[PDB]
Write a protein that binds this ligand. Structure first.
Ligand SMILES: [Cl-]
Length: 270
């Protein structure tokens, strides 16, 4: 509260030019200062759930030492659109760790569905998020049905604030044991799908990991990230968008611009 939005930023003009709604929550983990805009509204997760899915797998691996190296074979029926990694291993299978990396770093859809099944489906991932104290997150459906992004539909949504709070717990806090925490960070750092989103606002000499989401309808897309500016504490942030019409286009540039405004609001020189 007292450290929230100490410096106002023109998020309203940005979302008006975009023609929709932008939700932002950014936390300076050193001072506790935050930037918050529509931060408690629900927005569709789209593929951004796959980051939390990989964290849930890592959490289970703390109790099952063989889990990450377990080989998983799958049939052609498991390959759903946009499975760039898993399609190359159809004839061989992949390990749980490889599927998790593909889901995070390439947004591989077949990999995500296989891992979701392992965790007990959308309710199982939701249960994991409850277990770390996130009462907002909900996953309800599987890929690709979870991408419908229907206005007013709370299914398969969270808030920017809850996303940021949960990301902080998993990447910097105590929700994962130290080896699993660093593996989660390493997978996020290796993401290949986010170069035009939060990363476009982050100087090249800072470390960053992120997970994107893009629903394909209702101007709905998002990104969340941990950023390590040199010489100061890391920043955790989430940027989510949506728009009122089914055929509205998403914008990567708006996500990058919102991230820049969040870093400016926090007084982080970039
Ligand atoms: Cl895109």
């Amino acid at each position: 509260h007292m450290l929230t939005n100490l410096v106002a930023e023109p998020f309203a003009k940005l979302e008006q030019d975009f023609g929709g709604s932008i939700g932002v929550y950014a936390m300076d983990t050193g001072s506790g200062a935050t930037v918050s805009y529509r931060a408690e509204e629900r927005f569709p997760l789209c593929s951004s759930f796959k980051g939390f899915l990989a964290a849930a797998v890592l959490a289970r691996s703390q109790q099952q030492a063989g889990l990450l190296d377990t080989p998983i074979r799958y049939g052609k029926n498991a390959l759903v659109p946009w499975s760039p990694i898993s399609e190359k291993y159809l004839t061989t299978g992949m390990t749980v760790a490889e599927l998790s990396a593909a889901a995070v770093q390439y947004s591989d859809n077949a990999a995500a569905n296989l891992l979701l099944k392992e965790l007990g489906g959308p309710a199982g991932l939701t249960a994991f998020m409850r277990s770390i104290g996130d009462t907002t997150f909900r996953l309800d459906r599987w890929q690709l049905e979870l991408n419908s992004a229907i206005p007013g539909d709370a299914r398969d949504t969270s808030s920017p604030r809850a996303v940021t709070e949960s990301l902080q717990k998993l990447t910097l806090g105590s929700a994962l044991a130290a080896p699993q925490r660093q593996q989660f960070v390493d997978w996020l750092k290796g993401n290949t799908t986010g170069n035009h989103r939060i990363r476009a606002a982050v100087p090249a000499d800072w470390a960053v990991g992120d997970k994107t989401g893009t629903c394909g309808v209702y101007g709905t897309a998002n990104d969340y990230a941990v950023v390590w500016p040199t010489g100061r504490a890391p920043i955790v942030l989430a940027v989510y968008t949506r728009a009122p019409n089914k055929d509205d286009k998403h914008s990567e540039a708006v996500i990058a611009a919102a991230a820049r405004l969040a870093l400016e609001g926090l007084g982080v020189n970039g």
